Each structure stands twice: as structure tokens, then as C-alpha cells.
């Protein structure tokens, strides 16, 4: 389908346990600016980013949400473009499990929060900017999806991004296609 232009890895921990690595493929030709923001926050380039932040909200059979590195509760985060930035486009959809999309507070309020779907979420199409998909590591996404949460859907054991970074792609490549 769309072409992967850059990859990003996250090493996750659930409570006191190293659980594995997730590798994302990002669609920099489709949504260049939303991809640049995510990659810059994964490398910590501009002095702030995702390393050591938590996934604050996970709901089984829906998605896992993270990226609030300032407040850690869903109300914070910021982008490399300022505190919030506009919706770039809605060309890609939440096609099935493993797609990565921007969380927001309505139209044009993207910051740093994102979610990874664990099911197709067609009701979010056209309202959230989709910009990448999990290439490797869907089984560690399912382990975070299954952690116990309290009644506010917050993990009882902290799910931490212990390390993260960019992996260069020399030739953009299409995802498995149909």
C-alpha cells in the first residue's frame, strides 16, 4: 500500500519486566509532518520525547494509548511544531490491528499522544490522523493490551517506553498488499 520511509523502535517494560521490542513503519510520503514529529520525539532530538514515558490508557479489544510525556495522564504532551498542530490529512484509515494514529481533543489538536489499534476502528476514520503501522512486535502490543487496568483504564503496572530510536530506511518499501 503506502510506502514505509523510516522505522522507529520502542523497547517496553510492563512493571518490573522487559517485555520486548515493537518496530513501527511510518508513512513519510503520505503524512510527512506528522511522521517528522513522531520520529523527532522518538530520538529525543529537540531535547524532549517519548523515552521513559508511559502508556496511560489501555482498553482490551480497542487500543493502547501513550505519548503524554509532560503530564503522564492524557492532558499533556506537545509537538515539535508547538503545543498542538493541525490535522495534516486523513488519507490513511484505521484498517485493522496494529495501525498507529494521533490522539487529539477534536479538530486540529495534535500534540504527541498516539494510539496503536488492536482491532479495526472504523468509527475513528476521518477524525484521527493515521501515520504508521506495527511491522514487528504485535505480540508485545497484545501483552500490553492484556495488562490489568483500574476502572479509569489506567494500567495497574506501569507500561514504560524504556528506550526508543529511529532506524533509517535506504529504499522506501510498500506494505503487504491488498
Amino acid at each position: 500500500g503506502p510506502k514505509v520511509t523510516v522505522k522507529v523502535y520502542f523497547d517496553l517494560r510492563i512493571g518490573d519486566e522487559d517485555v520486548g521490542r515493537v518496530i513501527f513503519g511510518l508513512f513519510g510520503k503520505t503524512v510527512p509532518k506528522t511522521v517528522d514529529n513522531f520520529v523527532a520525539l522518538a530520538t529525543g532530538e529537540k531535547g524532549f520525547g517519548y523515552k521513559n514515558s508511559k502508556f496511560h490508557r489501555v482498553i482490551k479489544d480497542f487500543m493502547i494509548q501513550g505519548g503524554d510525556f509532560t503530564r503522564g495522564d492524557g492532558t499533556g504532551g506537545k509537538s515539535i511544531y508547538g503545543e498542538r498542530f493541525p490535522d495534516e490529512n486523513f488519507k490513511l484509515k484505521h484498517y485493522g490491528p496494529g495501525w498507529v494514529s494521533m490522539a487529539n481533543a477534536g479538530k486540529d489538536t495534535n500534540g504527541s499522544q498516539f494510539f496503536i489499534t488492536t482491532v479495526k476502528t472504523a468509527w475513528l476514520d476521518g477524525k484521527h490522523v493515521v501515520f504508521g503501522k506495527v511491522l514487528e512486535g504485535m505480540e508485545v502490543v497484545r501483552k500490553v493490551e492484556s495488562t490489568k487496568t483500574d476502572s479509569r483504564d489506567k494500567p495497574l503496572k506501569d507500561v514504560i517506553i524504556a528506550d526508543c530510536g529511529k532506524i533509517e530506511v535506504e529504499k522506501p518499501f510498500a506494505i503487504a498488499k491488498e
Binding site: 490508557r57 482498553i59 480497542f62 487500543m63 494509548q65 503524554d68 492524557g74 492532558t75 504532551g77 494514529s101 490522539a103 487529539n104 481533543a105 477534536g106 489538536t109 500534540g111 499522544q113 494510539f115 476502528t121 468509527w123 475513528l124 484521527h128
Partner: peptide, 11 residues
């Protein structure tokens, strides 16, 4: 319901 928002979490 099943939304993914940042600030006012809804049903």
C-alpha cells in the same frame, strides 16, 4: 464509548 481523546475523555 470508544474514543481516543486528550483532556476530556468521553464515553
Amino acid at each position: 464509548x470508544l474514543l481516543v481523546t486528550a483532556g476530556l475523555v468521553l464515553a
